[PDB]
Every structure is written in C-alpha cells, then in structure tokens.
Symmetry: D2
Subunit: 206 residues, 4 copies
C-alpha cells in the first residue's frame, strides 16, 4: 500500500454573485425597497425594541414578502436557481421535489449591531444576499459543526489549508449571495461602519 | 465576484502501510504473538464471555502490552511516528508535547463477529493496524459526525466525490495502519470469512 | 446550604403496555405471526446473510406488513395512539397533522445476536414493541446524545441514579411499547438467552 | 394507565450563593473592584472596540487577576470549592486530582450590550458569578445541546415545564454562582436596564 490521507464529510459553502442567475435586480431599487418596507413596518419596529433585537428584522412582522413585492418574487426566482445549483453540488436526492422558499426577511444592521451564533432549526438550505455593505468588514463567520466534539483535541494552527480551519470568515460585497446547510452555526460580526448593513436572509425546505 | 463553492471543516482519514515508519515488524511473528497472548489470557477470555463481547479483546485484562512485549514496544515506536505525521497533517498545536500512547489492545474477531458503532471517549487520535485479514471484506466503516445534524436534509447520492459521502468504508490489507480523530464514529463489519481477523487498536492522548 | 442543582434538556423515553391503545392484540398470536412471516421471508433471510446482519430483520425485504397482515394493521392503530400521546407529552406543534407510520419491521435476534449502535435518520419518533423476551435476554440500551461533547470531561462512575449515566438500559416485558425521538442512539446488546428475542420496530414521520 | 415517560441524559446546572464557600467576600467591594480594574484596562477597552465585542471583557488583556488582586484570590478559593461540590454531583472520577482554575475574567455589559452564543472550548466546568445585576437586566440563557439533532422534529410550544424547552433562562441575584459543563452553549440577551450588568466568568480544567 501507499500512504494516503483523505478528506471526508466536508461542509460546502456556496458564494456567488446574485446576478449568476434569475432575473436582474437593480441594486438601488433593491436597497430602497428594503428601507421603504422597514419604515412602514411599525409592528416589526416595536417587536425588535421589545425583544432586544439588534437591528431591524422583518421576520416576525412580514411573512409574505414575495407575494407582496415583485422585487422580492424576482429575488426568489434567482434564489431558487442558486439553491438548485447548490443542492446539485451537495448531491441531494430530491426525488421530484425541488427545494422551496420557506421564509425570507430583511435585516438592517445599524452601527454597533451584532447577531450571535445560531442555526435555522427545521430548514434544509439557508442563505443571505447583501443589499448594502459599508464595505468593510467580515459580515459572516461560520463555525465548525464538529467544534463541540473537539473538546479534548489540540487547537488547530490557522494555516493555509482552509478545509482544516475551525472558523471560516466571509467578506461578501454588495450583490453577493451566500448559501449553507441550515444546521451550520453562523454569527454576524458587529457592524463597525456608520452606514447600515442591509441584507436579505432566507430558508429553503424540502 | 465569481461563483465559488468551497469545502470546509473536513475530517481527515490516514491510511498507510505500517512499514511507512518505525522499526520493522515481522508479520508472522506479529500474528503469532497476538495469538500466544490471547491464549494465555484466561481473565480476558472470561470477561469477553461474561460481557457478551463479540471477539477476544485484551482491553480489560492487559494494560501494559508495550512494557511486556518488545514486539509491542516496536509497534508503538512505529505508531508514534505515524501519529506525529498525522497530527501534522491535522495542524494540531501541540506546544512541546507530542501525542502519546494511552491504551493499546488486541482483537481477534472470529467468523460471525461484528463491533457496533462507537467512539473512543476522552482520546485525541485512535487507530487500528491489521495483523491477519481473511482478506475480503471491508473491515471499517466511518460515519459522518454530522449525521445526526442532518435529520431534515435529503439523503445524498452515493456519487464519486468521496468528500460528500455520508459513510466511508475501508478495506485495508494486512500490514496497513488506519488513524482518525477519536470523536469519529466507526463500526466494524461482520467477519464473513472463516479465519480470524486479527487487529491491534490504540488511543493516543495529548 | 441554598445550593441547587437543576436538571435541564432531558431526553424523554416513553414506556407503556401496548394494550393501552388500539384494537386487542393477542401476544401469543403476535409471537406466532412474527415467526411465521420471518420463516417465509427468504429474501430477508438472504439479505441478512449477505449484509452481515445478525439474526433476522424484515426491513430490507417487506414493505407493507400493515396492509398485508391484519394483526399488523391492528398493531399500527395502537402505535398511532401511543405516538400521539408521546407527541402530546413532547409537546410538538402538530397543526391538525398527526405523525404517521413511515416504516415498520420484524426483528428476531437469536442466542449470540447483537444489533449495533445507530439512529433512525430523518424520522420524528422511533420505537419498539416487545414480542418474545426470554428468560433475560438483552435490554435495549440507550446512549447519551451528548457523549461526543463530553471528550474533555473525566469519566463518570456508574452513579446510578439513572440520571448521570452515559447509557441507560431498559429490560421491557412482552407487550410493552417503547418510544423515543429518532435522533437518539441505541443498541441491543448480545442476546445471551438460548431463545430468540423477537421485536417489531418502526418510525413515524410528520 | 401504566404509561411512564422517564427523563434521561439531563444537563445539570449548579446554582448557589457564592458565600457558601471560601473566604468572606464583600459584594460592594467586589462591584467596586471590577469597575476599578476595568477602568484601568485600556488594552482591554481597546481590544473590545477593535474586535467588535459589546461592553467590556478583561479576557484578552489581563491574565492573572487572582495573583494580582487579593479579592480575586479569595474569589478563587471559593470557586474551587463550588467546583469541587459540582464535580461531586457529576460524579466524575477525579483520582486525587481536583479541577483547577484555567481562566477567569471580568465582564461589564452596558445598556444595549449583548453577548453572543458560545461554548468554552477545551474546559471541563465553566461558570459565572454575579456582581451587579440591575433592576432586571439580562438572564444567562442556556441552549439545548441537542438543538442541532432536532431538525426533523416539529417545534415545541414553550411548554414550561422548564424541562422541554430548547433554551432555559436564569435570572440570578447578586452573589450567586452558576456552574455548568463547558460544552454547554449559552448567551446573554440584551441588557435593557440603564445600568451595567457586571459579572466574572471562568473555566476549570482537569
Ligand atoms: Fe442566521
Ligand atoms: Fe473502536
Ligand atoms: Fe433502532
Ligand atoms: Fe460564557
């Protein structure tokens, strides 16, 4: 035999321009629409304040964005195709049943805003597209799903083989879309800029 | 931006001939020694029968194999170097402190023997070298550590990108050594041959 | 001292007489039936041999036991109601959408048979009903979902107090049903009784 | 009905008055001290700003609080004994080898401060002592180690019954110590009181 060391059980991170598919979205219309919706949403504004929610999110107040706003139906038609390419990369056996949009929402993170580590319970693919970035810094940090199984293990060198690293930081530009499997833990670092960081996040189910 | 999909958080499986390092072991002496030890070990033989242990294991009866048997000290001197190469691949930050042998034991799996899925609690590297194989079939199956986080996810196609597969089966030859991180779940498929499958398994701590 | 130690995030295991729900089911007939169907099932017997599976499962060979065998349709009427009571205990938000049977199979574990550690991927509630239990005969043995998080911890003394143990064994009587959440790992230790341990296992999805 | 639902594999959370162990420690002096050390700690203040950390931790800047500040040496004498009582409850096999302090740090969380979800990698017992708690002020909130195993399950109604919840909030009083196993995920929700929430957090290893 020959000595071999093999990579197994790898997580895949998908990172593309939104414009890789689906109809075109105007970035100016895109940002302005996010703002116009958030400003008309008294109920979501109050829930954020009561719940101690760092930014604005539309998640508790608005459940039907693509029904109500052509630009959001347009967005979901791109996202649909991005999720299809990704389900393909991930080798999902879908039968006759594509992944479909379960939830979709706006975030507006002002300066000083942060979102603590979490997963999206009961979804298959989750993701975020970036509507306005600030335009440093990292906007997403993904944590190794095996981290809590690694308690007895030495910490790892922060070396140049990215597949061995324990956290992965992502620094998207406006227009980019990120996708991942929903069980993956992820955090959103503090907005250090004075301008808002606007993004749209979403869950796809099977 | 360019569309990219990246592999993250990968498990590494190390698979080498034992003879890749350390002093040479005679395979005939190696097998015969395993047998001679197991046959003199009344206490381990009785514990196996009482505990409903599929084969013979020396694990409960003999804690000091390398102290008692030059061939086992020889083996540990090879294994020491195999574990060093692997800790290097895994990018462990070890300070001034190499991984050292914690436990080491013989298994003799007769026809019809199987070992159910398990991990090795409280170790860093675990592994097995193969002393006598039978010489079909698969002797080790490794399970994706993320399997139980994948309950809502479609099953995956059994395709040709091994890093996306949910189980990995390993079919070693005599003389091979396998190593993995101890939190990784692994099972030993039934010995379908009539001859015993003899192996030596071990845990390294930090 | 005002020191309090609270228990949180406990895994629930449901245990009831089968007869508390559903049509009357005679245990002597029930045993007789499982033996009878397993005898005719050459496919099953052969897949078992081929796949190195100890004893005897119908899981690969036969797929609609409830529709074919009236006594399995009665069993399933009972399971539904047991499952519903468990979901009530858990207390899942079900809409008006009751969990339904997804698979059900017969196991016959002879003297010396073991069934290795495993979960039931992609199910919500999993469970077993006990058909013939020699003359003890092997427990179902449950494993702590947290075990792989525990690698840095010291070992726990079988401080029993069956709350602080890594595994939990159950010796059910004939006629009992056990249910658990499908992510919960479990095995069947070696049947050391001369007679067969017969059981029927199943999964429920939403 | 003879139906039983048993609780297994429960996570333990220890809660006691700090004063039940160790030298006397005055809470007014204790508060005064934490404020005082945090004020001098420009390094800490600056790392915080730089690293987008809300409020104020000493964890990056100061590394031997017990040796430098007598009141922290007294605190630690107390923690040792609290930890030992918890290890006794757990009941780890410790040899004659008591778990010892590995790190300890001051947190000061102002109005609007949050501390994101996280574990304490590579520790055995982790915990917090409460120093100034406005005028409620944020709970410590604990997350079910099993959450990522639960992706196929329905959502659970805040059926409280603080046994079946995915998170568990604690509102401790000034002078309380809380301890948990270091793999347990937890966060601090937004401090909504105008005044600072001061606490001291620590890890113990074997
Ligand atoms: Fe998220
Ligand atoms: Fe093993
Ligand atoms: Fe099972
Ligand atoms: Fe903490």
């Amino acid at each position: 035999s020959l000595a071999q060391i093999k990579s197994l059980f790898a997580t895949r991170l998908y990172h593309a321009p939104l414009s890789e598919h689906g109809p075109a979205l105007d970035p100016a219309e895109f940002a302005a629409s996010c703002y116009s919706i958030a400003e008309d949403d008294d109920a979501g504004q109050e829930w954020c304040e009561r719940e101690g929610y760092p930014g604005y999110t539309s998640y508790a107040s608005l459940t039907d964005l693509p029904w109500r706003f052509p630009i959001f139906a347009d967005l979901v038609k791109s996202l649909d195709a991005h999720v299809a390419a990704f389900a393909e990369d991930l080798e999902f056996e879908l039968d006759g049943k594509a992944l479909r949009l379960e939830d979709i929402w706006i975030n507006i993170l002002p300066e000083g805003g942060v979102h603590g580590s979490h997963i999206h319970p009961h979804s298959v693919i989750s993701g975020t597209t970036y509507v306005a970035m600030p335009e440093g810094t990292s906007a997403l940090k993904l944590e190794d799903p095996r981290l809590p199984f690694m308690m007895a293990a030495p910490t790892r060198r922060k070396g140049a083989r990215e597949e061995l690293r324990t956290f992965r930081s992502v620094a998207p530009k406006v227009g980019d879309v990120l996708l991942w499997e929903s069980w993956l833990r992820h955090e959103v670092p503090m907005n250090m800029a004075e301008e808002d960081r606007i993004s749209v996040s979403f869950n796809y189910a099977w």
